[PDB]
Amino acid sequence: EVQLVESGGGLVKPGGSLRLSCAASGFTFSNAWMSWVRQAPGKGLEWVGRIKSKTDGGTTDYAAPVKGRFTISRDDSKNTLYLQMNSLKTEDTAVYYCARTGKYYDFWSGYPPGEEYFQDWGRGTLVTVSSASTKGPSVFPLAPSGGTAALGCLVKDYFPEPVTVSWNSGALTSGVHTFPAVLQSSGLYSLSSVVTVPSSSLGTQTYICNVNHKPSNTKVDKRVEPK
Amino acid sequence: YELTQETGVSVALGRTVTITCRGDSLRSHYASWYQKKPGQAPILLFYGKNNRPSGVPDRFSGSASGNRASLTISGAQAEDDAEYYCSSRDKSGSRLSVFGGGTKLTVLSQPKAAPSVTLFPPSSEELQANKATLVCLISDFYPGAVTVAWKADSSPVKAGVETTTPSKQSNNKYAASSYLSLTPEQWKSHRSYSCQVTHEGSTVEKTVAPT
Ligand SMILES: [Zn+2]
Ligand SMILES: [Zn+2]
């Protein structure tokens, strides 16, 4: 019945601005308090701000890290909630969620009383704040140091995703793991690939990792030799 | 976090499991509980002492004692695989909600498997480019939840660390990686560096040393 759809996510450069929208249906929007909540790539959930209903003050509240830069507003006639983000920082990279909020009371004696729950949520929208532009990777060998040895390749500082990695032009697939990439604060990505090989084969078998980054037309091979 | 939850817990089909959040403010406040499946909108499961929203299954129940709030699932079902978050009023009393860091619940569907960990030092080639990255590769584990911590000379290292969330491999086990970025001078000035990988409370540690 209730649906919330966030939209507007994208890549923006630090210092830039972005507007998110949340289209609501299935409930009486004009009566609802609405919030934004965000989740940075590795670190859980964080309330961003709220707007009260118009029958109440229609006023806004904002989390400390965001005050003075973000503005929340609503157009009841289009059942839409907005988040205007200005002067964006790398620290603002996150999935942004719209949520309808409700209140209940516990046994705290403070003022103003009331717990806020997030009764309905959207799926969210990704906001990435980064000064990165298309860039091919640099490739470094991860040299081998029960009868098996692990060796690999470090694929460093590329943008955007993805990179493809093979070993020995696809002839070696057994015992390969190519790991999900990490997103650095620079906005660039890095990933690794490893293969486990018989120790008896080192120094007679050549191991080459093949790295393909299509957005930069980069195709680089790197030999991974024992120390 | 102001509210602390364990990174991951597992449960066999049909058994009971409890996920707990702890924090000083829970001595004075009730919590709400959320489920989030990968790529899906979070759902409100429970709040306060006895509020379960219509449509939430009866097996989900919330409770509170002392500095803890708990979510108990009484008879885990496969569809309960998800991240679970608690939330409560900010300890300062401010008109603000805070969230725990989330607990990944795995309802066991294959045998448990420990992480295989390999720690590589910076390559001679990278050092010649005046950079240094330690690479901690973590593979073949199940359930797919781990915590990673770095140390040097017995001291936790927090700056320069980037760690991926676990992702499923083509063999249906999970993999993850963590990177420690250092200057070449930093790398050479400490005796040893370690990557500690904790899987359901059990730690696997690997060490490297310059030279
Ligand atoms: Zn409270
Ligand atoms: Zn284990």
Author numbering:
A (entry chain H): 1 to 52, 52A, 52B, 52C, 53 to 82, 82A, 82B, 82C, ...
B (entry chain L): 2 to 9, 11 to 95, 95A, 95B, 95C, 96 to 106, 106A, 107 to 120, ...
Paper text:
X-ray diffraction data from these three structures extended to 3.05, 1.70, and 1.60 Å respectively, and they were solved by molecular replacement and refined to Rwork/Rfree of 18.8/21.5, 23.7/27.1, and 19.4/20.9% for ligand-free mature H and L, gHv/gLv, and gHv/mature L versions of 10E8, respectively. Electron density for an unknown ligand was observed adjacent to residue Ser 100c in the CDR H3 for the gHv/mature L 10E8 Fab. Differences were also seen in the gHv/mature L structure, though in this case, the CDR H3 was fully ordered. Thus maturation from germline to mature 10E8 affects the structure of the CDR H2 and H3 regions, and these structural changes occur primarily as a result of somatic hypermutation of the heavy chain V gene.
